[PDB]
Amino acid sequence: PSREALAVELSSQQEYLKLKERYDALQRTQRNLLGEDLGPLSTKELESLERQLDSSLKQIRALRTQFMLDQLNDLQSKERMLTETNKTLRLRL
Amino acid sequence: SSQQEYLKLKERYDALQRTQRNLLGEDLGPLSTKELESLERQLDSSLKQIRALRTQFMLDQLNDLQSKERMLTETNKTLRLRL
Amino acid sequence: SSQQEYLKLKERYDALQRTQRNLLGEDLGPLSTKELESLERQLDSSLKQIRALRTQFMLDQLNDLQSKERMLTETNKTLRLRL
Amino acid sequence: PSREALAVELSSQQEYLKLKERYDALQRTQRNLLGEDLGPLSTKELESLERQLDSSLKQIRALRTQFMLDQLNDLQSKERMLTETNKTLRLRL
């Protein structure tokens, strides 16, 4: 190979080890949410995680409920438009 | 294949950051009912494991202190009866 | 044995009213950790049944409206192509 | 039997049917908490029950946690008293 070619290849290995460290740290935080590898956490950290996860669970349930209600309102609107569109049977006369 | 190996990792990092924002209750709009329901099941399972750990930690501490109490009481009784 | 049959029922009513106050979060002081934990398991099970019912009710309503939409769209297409 | 004896016996049957109705109504409310026989309930009643039960579940978890913490503080206090009581080995000298 070449010297300048080694420096460019090893430079990529440097930014990969910067990204792998960022990925590993993200995967650590992700194991905690999901309730895994909880041992290293202090009872204060463990309490903070619980409050975060439950606030998050309350948000998502409220969102799934609102999303279902919005879908129901959208279908009733479509029904009213399809019925009043059907009533144009008045053309077929 | 060192250059493309970074893109593969960046794609994995980006996707993990997306899933991470979802748990935590952020960037929820693009998600379907099915997806939000799956998040709810995981968070509920996640909360039961945290709570089971907090409970077990308290029970372990309580068993340790009761054991110390049982050892101290029986030692004091010998001190007392031997006067 | 009609007079004592009332006391047996009153005792059953009193005990049920006690359990009823516990769920609802009232008169909790006399209760042990075991007892409070049992209440938590029942309330958590109770909430999942209510939520499963609210979800099923919404899904049934949504399936009914989508079915009406499918019937209306196919009827309008025949109206349109027959002009 | 006797007429006055019938009136007293049937009077007890009257107050029993007043108590049975009170018991049945309590058992109905109790089946709803416990998540059973939910069908007759309107979506508004069903939502109110959910809010009641979850507020109740949040109270009881906070209470079980505080009760465990109070037990831990009580045992540490007992330990300090039993240790300082043990140190009176100073008598056995």
PDB file of N, CA, C and O in Angstrom, chain A residues 25-58 60, chain B residues 19-20 22-25 42-54:
ATOM      1  N   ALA A  25     -23.146   3.928  23.986  1.00  0.00           N
ATOM      2  CA  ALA A  25     -23.743   4.769  25.023  1.00  0.00           C
ATOM      3  C   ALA A  25     -25.276   4.865  24.868  1.00  0.00           C
ATOM      4  O   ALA A  25     -25.998   4.841  25.867  1.00  0.00           O
ATOM      5  N   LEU A  26     -25.752   4.965  23.605  1.00  0.00           N
ATOM      6  CA  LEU A  26     -27.164   5.043  23.232  1.00  0.00           C
ATOM      7  C   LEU A  26     -27.843   3.717  23.528  1.00  0.00           C
ATOM      8  O   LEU A  26     -28.976   3.711  24.011  1.00  0.00           O
ATOM      9  N   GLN A  27     -27.146   2.599  23.234  1.00  0.00           N
ATOM     10  CA  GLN A  27     -27.627   1.242  23.485  1.00  0.00           C
ATOM     11  C   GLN A  27     -27.712   0.986  24.997  1.00  0.00           C
ATOM     12  O   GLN A  27     -28.626   0.295  25.429  1.00  0.00           O
ATOM     13  N   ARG A  28     -26.816   1.604  25.804  1.00  0.00           N
ATOM     14  CA  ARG A  28     -26.841   1.509  27.266  1.00  0.00           C
ATOM     15  C   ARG A  28     -28.113   2.152  27.833  1.00  0.00           C
ATOM     16  O   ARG A  28     -28.858   1.489  28.582  1.00  0.00           O
ATOM     17  N   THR A  29     -28.383   3.421  27.423  1.00  0.00           N
ATOM     18  CA  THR A  29     -29.580   4.187  27.794  1.00  0.00           C
ATOM     19  C   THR A  29     -30.843   3.460  27.330  1.00  0.00           C
ATOM     20  O   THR A  29     -31.840   3.434  28.038  1.00  0.00           O
ATOM     21  N   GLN A  30     -30.760   2.805  26.179  1.00  0.00           N
ATOM     22  CA  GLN A  30     -31.862   2.044  25.605  1.00  0.00           C
ATOM     23  C   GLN A  30     -32.129   0.761  26.369  1.00  0.00           C
ATOM     24  O   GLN A  30     -33.235   0.273  26.293  1.00  0.00           O
ATOM     25  N   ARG A  31     -31.120   0.159  27.011  1.00  0.00           N
ATOM     26  CA  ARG A  31     -31.342  -1.082  27.768  1.00  0.00           C
ATOM     27  C   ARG A  31     -32.078  -0.781  29.067  1.00  0.00           C
ATOM     28  O   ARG A  31     -32.947  -1.554  29.471  1.00  0.00           O
ATOM     29  N   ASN A  32     -31.785   0.388  29.668  1.00  0.00           N
ATOM     30  CA  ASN A  32     -32.432   0.913  30.869  1.00  0.00           C
ATOM     31  C   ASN A  32     -33.933   1.134  30.633  1.00  0.00           C
ATOM     32  O   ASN A  32     -34.738   0.619  31.402  1.00  0.00           O
ATOM     33  N   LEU A  33     -34.318   1.837  29.538  1.00  0.00           N
ATOM     34  CA  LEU A  33     -35.726   1.950  29.074  1.00  0.00           C
ATOM     35  C   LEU A  33     -35.811   0.581  28.442  1.00  0.00           C
ATOM     36  O   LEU A  33     -34.856   0.218  27.789  1.00  0.00           O
ATOM     37  N   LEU A  34     -36.835  -0.215  28.669  1.00  0.00           N
ATOM     38  CA  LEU A  34     -36.884  -1.651  28.265  1.00  0.00           C
ATOM     39  C   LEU A  34     -36.653  -2.523  29.507  1.00  0.00           C
ATOM     40  O   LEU A  34     -36.939  -3.723  29.453  1.00  0.00           O
ATOM     41  N   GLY A  35     -36.156  -1.892  30.597  1.00  0.00           N
ATOM     42  CA  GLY A  35     -35.956  -2.452  31.932  1.00  0.00           C
ATOM     43  C   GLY A  35     -34.873  -3.484  32.107  1.00  0.00           C
ATOM     44  O   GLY A  35     -34.991  -4.341  32.991  1.00  0.00           O
ATOM     45  N   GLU A  36     -33.799  -3.383  31.301  1.00  0.00           N
ATOM     46  CA  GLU A  36     -32.676  -4.310  31.314  1.00  0.00           C
ATOM     47  C   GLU A  36     -31.387  -3.653  31.825  1.00  0.00           C
ATOM     48  O   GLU A  36     -31.242  -2.430  31.718  1.00  0.00           O
ATOM     49  N   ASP A  37     -30.448  -4.466  32.369  1.00  0.00           N
ATOM     50  CA  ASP A  37     -29.147  -4.016  32.891  1.00  0.00           C
ATOM     51  C   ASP A  37     -29.294  -2.847  33.890  1.00  0.00           C
ATOM     52  O   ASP A  37     -28.577  -1.839  33.815  1.00  0.00           O
ATOM     53  N   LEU A  38     -30.238  -3.004  34.841  1.00  0.00           N
ATOM     54  CA  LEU A  38     -30.575  -1.980  35.828  1.00  0.00           C
ATOM     55  C   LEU A  38     -29.685  -1.905  37.058  1.00  0.00           C
ATOM     56  O   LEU A  38     -29.732  -0.895  37.755  1.00  0.00           O
ATOM     57  N   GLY A  39     -28.860  -2.941  37.273  1.00  0.00           N
ATOM     58  CA  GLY A  39     -27.928  -3.094  38.391  1.00  0.00           C
ATOM     59  C   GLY A  39     -26.989  -1.933  38.687  1.00  0.00           C
ATOM     60  O   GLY A  39     -26.930  -1.498  39.839  1.00  0.00           O
ATOM     61  N   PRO A  40     -26.231  -1.396  37.697  1.00  0.00           N
ATOM     62  CA  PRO A  40     -25.320  -0.268  37.984  1.00  0.00           C
ATOM     63  C   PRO A  40     -25.973   1.030  38.473  1.00  0.00           C
ATOM     64  O   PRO A  40     -25.297   1.862  39.075  1.00  0.00           O
ATOM     65  N   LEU A  41     -27.277   1.203  38.202  1.00  0.00           N
ATOM     66  CA  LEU A  41     -28.054   2.396  38.541  1.00  0.00           C
ATOM     67  C   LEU A  41     -28.328   2.599  40.036  1.00  0.00           C
ATOM     68  O   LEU A  41     -28.733   1.669  40.728  1.00  0.00           O
ATOM     69  N   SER A  42     -28.129   3.830  40.515  1.00  0.00           N
ATOM     70  CA  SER A  42     -28.395   4.182  41.903  1.00  0.00           C
ATOM     71  C   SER A  42     -29.887   4.273  42.080  1.00  0.00           C
ATOM     72  O   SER A  42     -30.593   4.516  41.095  1.00  0.00           O
ATOM     73  N   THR A  43     -30.387   4.081  43.317  1.00  0.00           N
ATOM     74  CA  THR A  43     -31.830   4.128  43.594  1.00  0.00           C
ATOM     75  C   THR A  43     -32.481   5.437  43.178  1.00  0.00           C
ATOM     76  O   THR A  43     -33.657   5.438  42.872  1.00  0.00           O
ATOM     77  N   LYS A  44     -31.702   6.521  43.088  1.00  0.00           N
ATOM     78  CA  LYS A  44     -32.157   7.836  42.646  1.00  0.00           C
ATOM     79  C   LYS A  44     -32.293   7.868  41.129  1.00  0.00           C
ATOM     80  O   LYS A  44     -33.298   8.392  40.626  1.00  0.00           O
ATOM     81  N   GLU A  45     -31.304   7.285  40.407  1.00  0.00           N
ATOM     82  CA  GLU A  45     -31.322   7.151  38.955  1.00  0.00           C
ATOM     83  C   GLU A  45     -32.491   6.237  38.547  1.00  0.00           C
ATOM     84  O   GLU A  45     -33.162   6.511  37.547  1.00  0.00           O
ATOM     85  N   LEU A  46     -32.699   5.144  39.309  1.00  0.00           N
ATOM     86  CA  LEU A  46     -33.737   4.140  39.094  1.00  0.00           C
ATOM     87  C   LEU A  46     -35.128   4.721  39.290  1.00  0.00           C
ATOM     88  O   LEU A  46     -36.058   4.323  38.594  1.00  0.00           O
ATOM     89  N   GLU A  47     -35.269   5.678  40.213  1.00  0.00           N
ATOM     90  CA  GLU A  47     -36.509   6.400  40.500  1.00  0.00           C
ATOM     91  C   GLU A  47     -36.813   7.400  39.388  1.00  0.00           C
ATOM     92  O   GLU A  47     -37.962   7.516  38.987  1.00  0.00           O
ATOM     93  N   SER A  48     -35.782   8.121  38.894  1.00  0.00           N
ATOM     94  CA  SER A  48     -35.878   9.112  37.811  1.00  0.00           C
ATOM     95  C   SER A  48     -36.333   8.449  36.501  1.00  0.00           C
ATOM     96  O   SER A  48     -37.172   9.011  35.793  1.00  0.00           O
ATOM     97  N   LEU A  49     -35.802   7.251  36.206  1.00  0.00           N
ATOM     98  CA  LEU A  49     -36.130   6.444  35.041  1.00  0.00           C
ATOM     99  C   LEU A  49     -37.608   6.030  35.101  1.00  0.00           C
ATOM    100  O   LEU A  49     -38.306   6.126  34.105  1.00  0.00           O
ATOM    101  N   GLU A  50     -38.075   5.608  36.278  1.00  0.00           N
ATOM    102  CA  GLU A  50     -39.444   5.205  36.520  1.00  0.00           C
ATOM    103  C   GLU A  50     -40.410   6.347  36.243  1.00  0.00           C
ATOM    104  O   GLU A  50     -41.440   6.130  35.614  1.00  0.00           O
ATOM    105  N   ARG A  51     -40.081   7.551  36.715  1.00  0.00           N
ATOM    106  CA  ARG A  51     -40.905   8.738  36.507  1.00  0.00           C
ATOM    107  C   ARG A  51     -40.966   9.136  35.035  1.00  0.00           C
ATOM    108  O   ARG A  51     -42.002   9.596  34.584  1.00  0.00           O
ATOM    109  N   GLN A  52     -39.851   8.983  34.309  1.00  0.00           N
ATOM    110  CA  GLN A  52     -39.694   9.282  32.888  1.00  0.00           C
ATOM    111  C   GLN A  52     -40.559   8.317  32.070  1.00  0.00           C
ATOM    112  O   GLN A  52     -41.338   8.755  31.214  1.00  0.00           O
ATOM    113  N   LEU A  53     -40.420   7.012  32.351  1.00  0.00           N
ATOM    114  CA  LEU A  53     -41.130   5.960  31.656  1.00  0.00           C
ATOM    115  C   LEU A  53     -42.617   6.014  31.881  1.00  0.00           C
ATOM    116  O   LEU A  53     -43.377   5.775  30.936  1.00  0.00           O
ATOM    117  N   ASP A  54     -43.056   6.357  33.092  1.00  0.00           N
ATOM    118  CA  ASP A  54     -44.483   6.424  33.318  1.00  0.00           C
ATOM    119  C   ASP A  54     -45.168   7.671  32.715  1.00  0.00           C
ATOM    120  O   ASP A  54     -46.250   7.551  32.166  1.00  0.00           O
ATOM    121  N   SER A  55     -44.474   8.806  32.685  1.00  0.00           N
ATOM    122  CA  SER A  55     -44.909  10.060  32.067  1.00  0.00           C
ATOM    123  C   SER A  55     -45.051   9.852  30.531  1.00  0.00           C
ATOM    124  O   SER A  55     -45.972  10.374  29.893  1.00  0.00           O
ATOM    125  N   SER A  56     -44.131   9.064  29.976  1.00  0.00           N
ATOM    126  CA  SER A  56     -43.995   8.632  28.601  1.00  0.00           C
ATOM    127  C   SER A  56     -45.147   7.677  28.265  1.00  0.00           C
ATOM    128  O   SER A  56     -45.794   7.875  27.257  1.00  0.00           O
ATOM    129  N   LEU A  57     -45.441   6.686  29.128  1.00  0.00           N
ATOM    130  CA  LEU A  57     -46.556   5.737  28.993  1.00  0.00           C
ATOM    131  C   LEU A  57     -47.900   6.468  29.043  1.00  0.00           C
ATOM    132  O   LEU A  57     -48.798   6.098  28.295  1.00  0.00           O
ATOM    133  N   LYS A  58     -48.042   7.508  29.896  1.00  0.00           N
ATOM    134  CA  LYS A  58     -49.272   8.324  29.977  1.00  0.00           C
ATOM    135  C   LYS A  58     -49.511   9.170  28.731  1.00  0.00           C
ATOM    136  O   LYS A  58     -50.666   9.362  28.357  1.00  0.00           O
ATOM    137  N   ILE A  60     -48.298   8.407  25.550  1.00  0.00           N
ATOM    138  CA  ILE A  60     -48.534   7.485  24.445  1.00  0.00           C
ATOM    139  C   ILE A  60     -49.933   6.896  24.455  1.00  0.00           C
ATOM    140  O   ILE A  60     -50.505   6.689  23.376  1.00  0.00           O
TER     141      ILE A  60
ATOM    142  N   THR B  19     -36.161   5.034  17.881  1.00  0.00           N
ATOM    143  CA  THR B  19     -36.799   4.150  18.858  1.00  0.00           C
ATOM    144  C   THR B  19     -36.654   4.733  20.264  1.00  0.00           C
ATOM    145  O   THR B  19     -37.600   4.664  21.055  1.00  0.00           O
ATOM    146  N   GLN B  20     -35.485   5.340  20.553  1.00  0.00           N
ATOM    147  CA  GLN B  20     -35.202   5.964  21.834  1.00  0.00           C
ATOM    148  C   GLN B  20     -36.059   7.205  22.078  1.00  0.00           C
ATOM    149  O   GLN B  20     -36.374   7.499  23.230  1.00  0.00           O
ATOM    150  N   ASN B  22     -39.118   7.727  20.823  1.00  0.00           N
ATOM    151  CA  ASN B  22     -40.460   7.143  20.939  1.00  0.00           C
ATOM    152  C   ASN B  22     -40.777   6.768  22.394  1.00  0.00           C
ATOM    153  O   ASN B  22     -41.720   7.320  22.960  1.00  0.00           O
ATOM    154  N   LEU B  23     -39.935   5.903  23.021  1.00  0.00           N
ATOM    155  CA  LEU B  23     -39.918   5.616  24.467  1.00  0.00           C
ATOM    156  C   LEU B  23     -39.401   6.991  24.897  1.00  0.00           C
ATOM    157  O   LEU B  23     -38.600   7.527  24.150  1.00  0.00           O
ATOM    158  N   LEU B  24     -39.880   7.626  25.966  1.00  0.00           N
ATOM    159  CA  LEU B  24     -39.504   9.034  26.308  1.00  0.00           C
ATOM    160  C   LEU B  24     -40.566  10.004  25.784  1.00  0.00           C
ATOM    161  O   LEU B  24     -40.581  11.170  26.190  1.00  0.00           O
ATOM    162  N   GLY B  25     -41.449   9.496  24.915  1.00  0.00           N
ATOM    163  CA  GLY B  25     -42.621  10.183  24.383  1.00  0.00           C
ATOM    164  C   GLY B  25     -42.422  11.327  23.411  1.00  0.00           C
ATOM    165  O   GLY B  25     -43.270  12.222  23.340  1.00  0.00           O
ATOM    166  N   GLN B  42     -44.233  -2.346  25.888  1.00  0.00           N
ATOM    167  CA  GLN B  42     -42.836  -2.368  26.277  1.00  0.00           C
ATOM    168  C   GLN B  42     -42.575  -1.494  27.506  1.00  0.00           C
ATOM    169  O   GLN B  42     -41.906  -1.946  28.423  1.00  0.00           O
ATOM    170  N   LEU B  43     -43.150  -0.277  27.555  1.00  0.00           N
ATOM    171  CA  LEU B  43     -43.021   0.629  28.692  1.00  0.00           C
ATOM    172  C   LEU B  43     -43.659   0.061  29.936  1.00  0.00           C
ATOM    173  O   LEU B  43     -43.126   0.252  31.024  1.00  0.00           O
ATOM    174  N   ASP B  44     -44.798  -0.626  29.792  1.00  0.00           N
ATOM    175  CA  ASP B  44     -45.505  -1.243  30.919  1.00  0.00           C
ATOM    176  C   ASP B  44     -44.649  -2.385  31.497  1.00  0.00           C
ATOM    177  O   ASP B  44     -44.522  -2.483  32.709  1.00  0.00           O
ATOM    178  N   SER B  45     -43.976  -3.158  30.622  1.00  0.00           N
ATOM    179  CA  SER B  45     -43.104  -4.273  30.976  1.00  0.00           C
ATOM    180  C   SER B  45     -41.818  -3.755  31.641  1.00  0.00           C
ATOM    181  O   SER B  45     -41.322  -4.340  32.601  1.00  0.00           O
ATOM    182  N   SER B  46     -41.310  -2.648  31.137  1.00  0.00           N
ATOM    183  CA  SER B  46     -40.143  -1.901  31.571  1.00  0.00           C
ATOM    184  C   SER B  46     -40.385  -1.384  33.009  1.00  0.00           C
ATOM    185  O   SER B  46     -39.534  -1.573  33.862  1.00  0.00           O
ATOM    186  N   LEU B  47     -41.558  -0.792  33.280  1.00  0.00           N
ATOM    187  CA  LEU B  47     -41.966  -0.268  34.593  1.00  0.00           C
ATOM    188  C   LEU B  47     -42.170  -1.381  35.638  1.00  0.00           C
ATOM    189  O   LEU B  47     -41.823  -1.207  36.804  1.00  0.00           O
ATOM    190  N   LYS B  48     -42.683  -2.541  35.224  1.00  0.00           N
ATOM    191  CA  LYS B  48     -42.823  -3.625  36.171  1.00  0.00           C
ATOM    192  C   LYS B  48     -41.444  -4.186  36.614  1.00  0.00           C
ATOM    193  O   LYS B  48     -41.302  -4.539  37.778  1.00  0.00           O
ATOM    194  N   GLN B  49     -40.428  -4.195  35.723  1.00  0.00           N
ATOM    195  CA  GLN B  49     -39.058  -4.656  36.040  1.00  0.00           C
ATOM    196  C   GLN B  49     -38.324  -3.692  36.979  1.00  0.00           C
ATOM    197  O   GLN B  49     -37.621  -4.134  37.898  1.00  0.00           O
ATOM    198  N   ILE B  50     -38.533  -2.389  36.788  1.00  0.00           N
ATOM    199  CA  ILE B  50     -37.951  -1.345  37.622  1.00  0.00           C
ATOM    200  C   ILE B  50     -38.577  -1.440  39.004  1.00  0.00           C
ATOM    201  O   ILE B  50     -37.869  -1.497  40.008  1.00  0.00           O
ATOM    202  N   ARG B  51     -39.898  -1.494  39.047  1.00  0.00           N
ATOM    203  CA  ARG B  51     -40.618  -1.609  40.308  1.00  0.00           C
ATOM    204  C   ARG B  51     -40.303  -2.913  41.063  1.00  0.00           C
ATOM    205  O   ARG B  51     -40.119  -2.844  42.268  1.00  0.00           O
ATOM    206  N   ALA B  52     -40.129  -4.058  40.364  1.00  0.00           N
ATOM    207  CA  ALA B  52     -39.750  -5.342  40.964  1.00  0.00           C
ATOM    208  C   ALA B  52     -38.352  -5.247  41.546  1.00  0.00           C
ATOM    209  O   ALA B  52     -38.106  -5.852  42.578  1.00  0.00           O
ATOM    210  N   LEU B  53     -37.454  -4.453  40.924  1.00  0.00           N
ATOM    211  CA  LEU B  53     -36.096  -4.224  41.403  1.00  0.00           C
ATOM    212  C   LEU B  53     -36.090  -3.343  42.641  1.00  0.00           C
ATOM    213  O   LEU B  53     -35.450  -3.703  43.624  1.00  0.00           O
ATOM    214  N   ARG B  54     -36.804  -2.216  42.619  1.00  0.00           N
ATOM    215  CA  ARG B  54     -36.924  -1.326  43.783  1.00  0.00           C
ATOM    216  C   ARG B  54     -37.477  -2.111  45.011  1.00  0.00           C
ATOM    217  O   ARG B  54     -36.957  -1.963  46.116  1.00  0.00           O
TER     218      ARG B  54
END
